[PDB]
Amino acid sequence: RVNITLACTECGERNYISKKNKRNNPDRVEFKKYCPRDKKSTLHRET
Amino acid sequence: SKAYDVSEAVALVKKTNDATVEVAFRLGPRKNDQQIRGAVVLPNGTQRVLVFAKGEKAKEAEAAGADFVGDTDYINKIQQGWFDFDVIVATPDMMGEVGKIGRVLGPKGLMPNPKTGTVTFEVEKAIGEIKAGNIHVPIGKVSFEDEKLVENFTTMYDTILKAKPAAAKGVYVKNVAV
């Protein structure tokens, strides 16, 4: 398992930091939650 | 061998011909931080300026003198064709979108960039004023009189010097070639 940071798409900054397994999920996942700066929930992707 | 004067060279570039009198000026990269590149409206002074106005700014762009504005996107008409004419300016909203299209403006010298005062909200005032460390500047014609190029070179030199670059230390002047 490794540590991962999530990046905002609309606003464009790191908001959430977490962990995932390389083998089970070898690809980049689309997580959807709140971006506080935008005052509105936006899609997130990891870098 | 002799460095002529400004009052002699304007009357003499009459005799170096309807041609255009232009000025080279060697600047004094190390100093790229305080480089000297720019544009200013001219005193003693045909272009075809096409604009990329967005929203309400097209409504004041069609009365100032511009030839073609657009249907809010004609870069697809720019793709596979597009004999560009004179000057491309834009507005600070669609500049990023036009820019993400590629170097159809890179090696052609018309890419909108707000360092030059050409990408702004005042498109009506922008149409009306445009119509190795070196700057080129067209100050005028052969057929202008002797008192026109003196103010033209004076205005351009005061613009250069008004802009006394930071790191002013060391000589700023190297050469004027009229």
């Binding site: 940071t5 990046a7 070898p26 990891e46 | 790229n32 993400k100 890419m111 909108p112 960039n113 360092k115």
Partner: protein
């Protein structure tokens, strides 16, 4: 595996990016002159993809630039960094000239944009005629996702170190070993800046050699955090188990340099260089052999080796010497046999108010280490501890490696 390389001009966040990709070995300062001076390797991870990374540099400038060209060709894709705050400079096109004739894929990057408002001003960067620029930031992890994908699109054991003081020939030593031009050699002191990795195979056995650019006196290090490079040497020592020491054919700092290695519980080997420089005739080696023995006595297990980099003599013997030190540093013994001899030592020296010996056993095998079960932990004498040390180092080899000894109480 795929190889990636980054090139550019002084002050473009390259070493910085490379570190942000993985690790912090790359040295980072703020000034024009201080840049990574040579190639360095590493490993990366981006999805199933797992390519590496080659870092380059911007007095002597021809060599490093040439080294960069070496990287240029043997690479798979090209990373071309450039600054965003100050637009386009002369050096940008200067390097662009060779990039144009470089029949390799190119991915451009723009740094120094760490805020949304600064994300603009990319249209100007359309001169190269290359593809789409993708902004990145060093202080923050911005815009890296687009860059990596841009790269992934075209994308399809022991270790020993050598140390010394600056201006001795340590860089010349290595390159010659591989027989390959790998690191820069100059006649000025402290030419190398930071540690460089080098992996190679010898006799069906792979090895990893490392440089540490030499070290000056500890009061002599007053520079723009050039200790920041000195620490990299320290980390390198921790990374590998075997250290070779290189002296030129004696100064007390060389003893001080050997100070860190001995306490580190890492095998250490003595090497000399430039033997051609001095007189070389009958029985010459003895003078140095006892001088180093007389000077260096807190270490004894270190074998003495002789080589001269320039004429390349006896260099073959160096490698094997390293292998022998290895298992010695990783060796356990049967506890029965060890305790079998502990008494003989005490029989011959029945003068330890008196200490008593009951048991001793090997615990730490990573570095030869053991523990003795005695009656009074205070009653001992360091000379007696030095006595039991030699006896054991004479019963078996344990040569070329240090030994740590512990004395627990009866409990």
């Amino acid at each position: 595996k795929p190889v990636v390389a980054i090139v550019g001009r002084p002050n473009v966040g390259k070493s910085t990016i490379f570190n942000r990709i993985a690790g912090e070995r790359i040295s980072i300062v703020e000034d024009t002159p201080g840049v990574t001076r040579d190639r360095i390797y590493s490993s990366a991870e981006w999805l199933n993809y797992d390519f590496n990374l080659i870092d380059t540099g911007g007095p002597f400038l021809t060599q490093i630039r040439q080294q960069a060209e070496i990287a240029m060709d043997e690479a798979d894709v090209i990373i071309f960094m450039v600054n965003g705050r100050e637009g386009v400079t002369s050096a940008d096109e200067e390097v662009a000239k060779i990039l144009y004739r470089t029949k390799k894929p190119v991915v451009l990057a723009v740094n120094k944009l760490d805020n949304t408002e600064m994300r603009a001003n990319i249209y100007d960067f359309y001169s190269l005629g290359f593809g789409e620029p993708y902004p990145i930031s060093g202080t923050h992890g911005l815009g890296l996702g687009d860059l990596l994908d841009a790269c992934a699109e075209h994308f399809k054991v022991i270790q020993f170190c050598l140390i010394g003081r600056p201006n001795v020939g340590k860089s010349s030593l290595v390159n010659a070993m591989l027989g390959e031009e790998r690191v820069i050699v100059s006649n000025v002191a402290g030419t190398t800046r930071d540690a460089v990795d080098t992996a190679f195979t010898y006799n069906q056995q792979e090895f990893v050699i490392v440089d540490t650019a030499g070290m000056r006196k500890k009061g002599k290090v007053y520079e723009t955090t050039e200790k920041y490079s000195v620490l990299r040497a320290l980390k390198a020592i921790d990374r590998s188990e075997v250290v070779g020491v290189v002296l030129d054919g004696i100064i007390e700092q060389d003893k001080r340099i050997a100070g860190y290695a001995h306490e580190a519980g890492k095998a250490v080997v003595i090497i000399v260089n430039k033997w051609d420089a001095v007189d070389k005739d009958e029985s010459t080696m003895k003078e140095f052999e006892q001088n180093i023995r007389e000077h260096f006595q807190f270490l004894d297990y270190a074998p003495v080796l002789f080589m001269s980099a320039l004429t390349k003599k006896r260099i073959h013997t160096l490698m094997p010497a390293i292998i022998k030190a290895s298992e010695n540093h990783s060796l356990r013994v049967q506890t029965n046999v060890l305790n079998d001899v502990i008494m003989d030592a005490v029989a011959m020296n029945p003068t330890p108010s008196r200490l008593k010996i009951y048991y001793a056993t090997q615990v730490s095998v990573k570095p030869p280490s053991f523990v003795v079960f005695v009656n009074d932990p205070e009653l001992m004498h360091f000379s007696y501890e030095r006595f039991l040390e030699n006896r054991i180092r004479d019963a078996f080899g344990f040569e070329g490696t240090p030994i740590k000894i512990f004395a627990r109480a009866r409990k």
